[PDB]
Motif scaffolding. Structure first.
Motif, short mmCIF file in Angstrom:
data_model
loop_
_atom_site.label_atom_id
_atom_site.label_comp_id
_atom_site.label_asym_id
_atom_site.label_seq_id
_atom_site.Cartn_x
_atom_site.Cartn_y
_atom_site.Cartn_z
N UNK A 70 -66.72 -60.80 -28.12
CA UNK A 70 -66.83 -62.05 -28.80
C UNK A 70 -65.65 -62.09 -29.94
N UNK A 71 -65.20 -60.96 -30.60
CA UNK A 71 -64.28 -60.95 -31.48
C UNK A 71 -62.84 -61.50 -30.94
N UNK A 72 -62.43 -61.14 -29.79
CA UNK A 72 -61.35 -61.62 -29.23
C UNK A 72 -61.58 -62.94 -28.65
N UNK A 73 -62.47 -63.28 -28.04
CA UNK A 73 -62.69 -64.52 -27.42
C UNK A 73 -62.75 -65.89 -28.39
N UNK A 74 -63.27 -65.60 -29.42
CA UNK A 74 -63.32 -66.61 -30.53
C UNK A 74 -61.94 -67.08 -31.26
N UNK A 75 -61.03 -65.97 -31.20
CA UNK A 75 -59.77 -66.35 -31.67
C UNK A 75 -58.85 -66.97 -30.60
N UNK A 76 -59.26 -66.47 -29.16
CA UNK A 76 -58.69 -67.44 -28.07
C UNK A 76 -58.92 -68.99 -28.03
N UNK A 77 -60.43 -69.34 -28.46
CA UNK A 77 -60.66 -70.65 -28.55
C UNK A 77 -60.24 -71.28 -29.79
N UNK A 78 -59.85 -70.54 -31.07
CA UNK A 78 -59.09 -71.07 -32.10
C UNK A 78 -57.77 -71.28 -32.11
N UNK A 79 -56.99 -70.63 -30.68
CA UNK A 79 -55.83 -71.11 -30.55
C UNK A 79 -55.44 -72.57 -30.22
N UNK A 80 -54.50 -73.19 -30.78
CA UNK A 80 -54.13 -74.49 -30.70
C UNK A 80 -52.93 -74.70 -30.03
N UNK A 81 -52.46 -75.78 -29.89
CA UNK A 81 -50.92 -76.34 -29.30
C UNK A 81 -50.07 -76.02 -30.65
N UNK A 82 -50.54 -75.56 -31.92
CA UNK A 82 -49.64 -75.65 -32.90
C UNK A 82 -49.25 -74.26 -33.59
N UNK A 83 -50.11 -73.19 -33.09
CA UNK A 83 -49.94 -71.96 -33.38
C UNK A 83 -48.47 -71.08 -33.23
N UNK A 84 -48.37 -70.25 -34.23
CA UNK A 84 -46.88 -69.64 -33.64
C UNK A 84 -47.04 -68.71 -32.54
N UNK A 85 -47.76 -68.05 -32.22
CA UNK A 85 -47.70 -67.15 -31.12
C UNK A 85 -47.99 -67.56 -29.83
N UNK A 86 -47.35 -68.75 -29.48
CA UNK A 86 -47.59 -69.26 -28.40
C UNK A 86 -46.28 -69.11 -27.20
N UNK A 87 -46.36 -68.60 -26.08
CA UNK A 87 -45.42 -67.99 -25.40
C UNK A 87 -45.51 -68.07 -23.94
N UNK A 88 -44.54 -67.60 -23.32
CA UNK A 88 -44.47 -67.58 -21.86
C UNK A 88 -44.73 -66.20 -21.53
N UNK A 89 -45.74 -65.72 -21.10
CA UNK A 89 -46.30 -64.14 -20.54
C UNK A 89 -45.57 -63.91 -19.34
N UNK A 136 -61.75 -79.69 -20.74
CA UNK A 136 -62.85 -79.15 -20.25
C UNK A 136 -62.61 -77.61 -20.08
N UNK A 137 -61.60 -76.92 -19.99
CA UNK A 137 -61.70 -75.58 -20.08
C UNK A 137 -61.89 -75.01 -21.53
N UNK A 138 -61.45 -75.85 -22.38
CA UNK A 138 -62.14 -75.67 -23.99
C UNK A 138 -63.79 -75.63 -23.96
N UNK A 139 -64.30 -76.40 -23.24
CA UNK A 139 -65.80 -76.50 -22.83
C UNK A 139 -66.40 -75.35 -22.25
N UNK A 140 -65.69 -74.85 -21.43
CA UNK A 140 -66.01 -73.64 -20.59
C UNK A 140 -66.00 -72.49 -21.26
N UNK A 141 -64.75 -72.30 -22.24
CA UNK A 141 -64.84 -71.14 -23.04
C UNK A 141 -65.73 -70.98 -24.20
N UNK A 142 -66.10 -72.22 -24.68
CA UNK A 142 -67.14 -72.20 -25.80
C UNK A 142 -68.52 -72.04 -25.14
N UNK A 143 -68.92 -72.40 -23.98
CA UNK A 143 -70.08 -71.70 -23.31
C UNK A 143 -70.03 -70.22 -22.93
N UNK A 144 -68.90 -69.79 -22.65
CA UNK A 144 -68.80 -68.35 -22.72
C UNK A 144 -69.17 -67.53 -23.74
N UNK A 145 -68.75 -68.15 -24.73
CA UNK A 145 -68.91 -67.60 -26.25
C UNK A 145 -70.45 -67.81 -26.47
#
Lengths: 113, 98, 49, 52, 49, 49, 53, 87, 17, 54, 50, 49, 34, 53, 46
Positions: N21-40, J5-14
């Protein structure tokens, strides 16, 4: 002989990394030489193009023109030779990377022993 | 002297919109330089991506006798290499045309 | 006849003055001169009298 | 999720193409000899992508 | 007479260009015919694999 | 005018020479292709035997 | 084996139709004042192929 | 065997050699006073030639911008796919 | 630094006087 | 499920930010057109001023 | 814009007083100085994001 | 086990003295081309003056 | 299993010019897979 | 001069939209599998620029 | 070993401090070059 063999491979690898850094710097220097010779061709040929707009008797077969033709030919030979040097330096960097990967694999397998 | 008046008005109009055409030509030459600079930056970035992918594959292919495995990522890497080859060649063709 | 020879020298003077301007602008053309560009085939192209 | 030619490459026997990009996937022909290349002549246009 | 001589001169280059473009067309036809054999050989080698 | 007769004749002659060289290169390519296909078929027959 | 052969023939036919579409779109894209037009040698000829519809 | 004409006009040769590079030099080795219609013809050809070159450059820019965006996005998505597969 | 690699093609034009 | 559901919210913001960018693109192109169309009119006043000079 | 406006403005000048005075060479220097300034500002902008 | 070691060290030092010869010849050619082209540019300015 | 894991971990953790990214040539041609 | 002012403001705002847009599309493309997943270091960190909708 | 552990951490700390040093150098060159350009343009306008 595992220990001193491993130390020999380690020294070879460290100096190989050094030499690859110098070869990369050589590559960038050849690139800078190429682009400045291109600008020199631009200046010489623009001058030769603008010069031939003269009035009727002022079109003259001057020693300036008989030198500008050799100018364009000499800068053509210069940029050709520097392009050849760029290809040769890329080839030698390829051989260095091959040696680096080979001795990396041998360092790992001797370090297992 | 009215013939001279005719000729001077005629030549002055020729001067004036020659000047207009010159200004438009210079501005378009500016934007052409900026576009070819963008093309060169793109070519060096795609060369960096090719470096990364082919280094990954040649580092992977040294695996032992049992684990020489044809996973999905190997086929993906081969497809990526030829895709970025096609990308690079298209960028050089656009550079030559510009 | 004197008017004729005077006009001949005046048209030659105009030719020399324009060629002087051309060769002056060619002489001061250095690198970084903000007036240069590539030209193709100029190394072969010539009219010469 | 993956299409079929990569799956028959995954399996055992060699019921796959020796050439890796299948023609029903590529934008362009394999081994296709035509460009429609034009030349710079002044006053007559320069048309890019004549094949499309 | 000079104009007729020039017509006689241009006819030779017209005929030579005509002959050369026809020979190039026949030769590139033979090379396309040799090209299709390679594709059928590639398929007939895809069988034994 | 735009050309002298030697320039116009040399224009046509250079076109003829380039086209003739390309025809000769395509002929040699056809002979190479035939040699390659012959060698391929004989080697694969020997391996199957 | 039979399915492999049929797919080979369909691949060849698909390649032919893509190249055909490409040449026909170029011939449509040509117009007046274009730098590639000229008088062509024997444009009314019929080649050796001469397939009918 | 050329000769010297006191007005010399190589402008047509300059256009022809700019079009085609293999025309070797046109130089004196071994009618004046243009009509008024040529005055109009020259400037109309100049204006159409400038407009033609400028519009070709414009169409090249728009096609080039779309090409750059498409190739950048495609290669980024393929790299993401390969990283997912290795993971 | 010094713009030794880039050359634009224009200036503020006046011909001859 | 919270991931989806947060994936859906973020795609809406896109979608919304892409809508705003596409809405400003027309204004940018139109302002280019308008400054050129206004700059021609001063050149009309130019030639009229010399035509009243004589 | 103001430098190019003044350069085009000084071409309305009538033919006795159409002059290459002290103003013309300084306006040419102004145009080249302004362009050099903004090109160098573009290049340091390029350095900053890297 | 020895014959792998000696060949490894041979290929290492061969690559090294190849690269060192390359680097010194590269610097020499860069200096030669720079001085020659600067010289003939000065000659160009002299003849135009 | 541990050897395959360390090789594939190294291959996964590369990025665009992380460290040691280099041009090779001709590893596209190998298929020596068991 | 007024048209130049409005053009500059709209160009800056458009460039900002492209960046987010250019940063948020990459944030969407972030997965469970990506290398740069970390505790900020500090999640739920509202920054100095708090600009609501 | 712990010496490799501490060596690794201090070497990356060194790289980070080098990055900060480069940013401060760029800052100084930036405000210098803005003062230079503004003074030159106002001088030629005068």
């Amino acid at each position: 002989e595992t220990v001193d063999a491993k130390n020999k491979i380690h020294t070879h690898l460290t100096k190989t990394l050094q030499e690859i850094f110098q070869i990369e710097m050589t590559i960038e220097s050849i690139k800078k030489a190429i682009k400045e010779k291109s600008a020199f061709l631009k200046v010489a040929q623009t001058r030769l193009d603008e010069r031939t707009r003269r009035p009727n008797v002022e079109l003259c077969r001057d020693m300036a023109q008989l030198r500008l033709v050799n100018e364009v030919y000499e800068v053509d030979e210069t940029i050709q030779t520097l392009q050849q040097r760029l290809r040769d330096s890329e080839d030698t960097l390829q051989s260095l990377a091959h040696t680096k990967a080979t001795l990396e694999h041998d360092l790992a397998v001797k370090a297992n022993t | 002297n009215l013939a001279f008046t005719n000729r001077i008005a005629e030549t002055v109009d020729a001067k004036n919109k020659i000047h207009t055409h010159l200004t438009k030509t210079l501005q378009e030459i500016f934007q052409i330089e900026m576009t070819i600079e963008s093309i060169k930056k793109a070519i060096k970035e795609k060369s960096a991506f090719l470096k990364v992918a082919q280094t990954r594959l040649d580092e992977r292919t040294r695996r032992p006798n049992v684990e020489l495995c044809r996973d999905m990522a190997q086929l993906r890497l081969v497809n990526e290499v030829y895709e970025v080859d096609e990308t690079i060649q298209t960028l050089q063709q656009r550079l030559r045309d510009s | 006849s004197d008017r004729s020879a005077q006009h001949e020298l005046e048209k030659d003077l105009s030719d020399k003055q324009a060629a002087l301007r051309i060769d002056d602008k060619c002489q001061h053309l250095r690198n970084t001169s903000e007036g240069v560009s590539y030209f193709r085939g100029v190394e072969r192209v010539d009219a010469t009298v | 999720g993956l299409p079929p030619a990569y799956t028959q490459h995954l399996r055992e026997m060699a019921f796959w193409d020796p050439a890796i990009t299948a023609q029903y996937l590529n934008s362009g022909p394999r081994w296709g000899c035509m460009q429609w290349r034009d030349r710079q002549i002044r006053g007559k246009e320069f048309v890019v992508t004549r094949n499309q | 007479r000079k104009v007729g001589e020039r017509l006689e001169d241009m006819h030779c280059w017209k005929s030579e260009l005509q002959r050369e473009i026809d020979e190039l067309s026949s030769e590139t036809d033979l090379m396309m015919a040799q090209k299709l054999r390679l594709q059928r050989a590639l398929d007939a080698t895809s069988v034994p694999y | 005018s735009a050309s002298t007769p030697e320039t116009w004749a040399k224009f046509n002659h250079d076109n003829l020479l380039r086209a003739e060289r390309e025809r000769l290169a395509s002929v040699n390519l056809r002979k190479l292709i035939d040699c390659i296909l012959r060698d391929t078929a004989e080697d694969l027959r020997l391996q199957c035997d | 084996c039979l399915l492999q052969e049929i797919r080979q023939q369909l691949n060849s036919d698909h390649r032919d139709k893509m190249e055909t579409l490409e040449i026909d779109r170029g011939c449509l894209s040509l117009n007046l004042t274009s730098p590639n037009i000229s008088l062509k040698v024997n444009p009314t000829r019929i080649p050796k192929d001469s397939t009918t519809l | 065997t050329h000769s010297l004409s006191l007005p010399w006009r190589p402008n047509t040769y300059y256009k022809t050699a700019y079009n085609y590079p293999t025309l070797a030099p046109y130089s004196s080795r071994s009618f004046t006073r243009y009509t008024p219609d040529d005055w109009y013809r020259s400037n109309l050809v100049s204006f159409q030639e400038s407009n033609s070159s400028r519009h070709n450059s414009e169409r090249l820019r728009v096609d080039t911008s779309r090409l750059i965006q498409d190739k950048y996005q495609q290669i980024r998505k393929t790299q993401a796919h390969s990283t997912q597969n290795l993971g | 630094g010094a713009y030794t690699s880039s050359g634009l093609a224009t200036a503020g034009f006046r011909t001859a006087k | 499920w919270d991931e989806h559901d947060n994936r859906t919210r973020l795609a809406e913001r896109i979608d919304t930010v892409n809508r705003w960018k596409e809405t400003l693109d027309k204004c940018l192109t139109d302002l280019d057109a308008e400054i050129d169309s206004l700059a021609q009119a001063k050149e009309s006043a130019e030639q009229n001023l010399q035509a009243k000079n004589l | 814009s103001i430098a190019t406006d003044n350069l085009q403005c000084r071409e309305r000048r009538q033919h006795p007083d159409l002059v290459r005075d002290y103003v013309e060479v300084e306006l040419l220097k102004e145009t080249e100085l302004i362009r050099n300034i903004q090109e160098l500002l573009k290049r340091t902008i390029g350095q900053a994001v890297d």
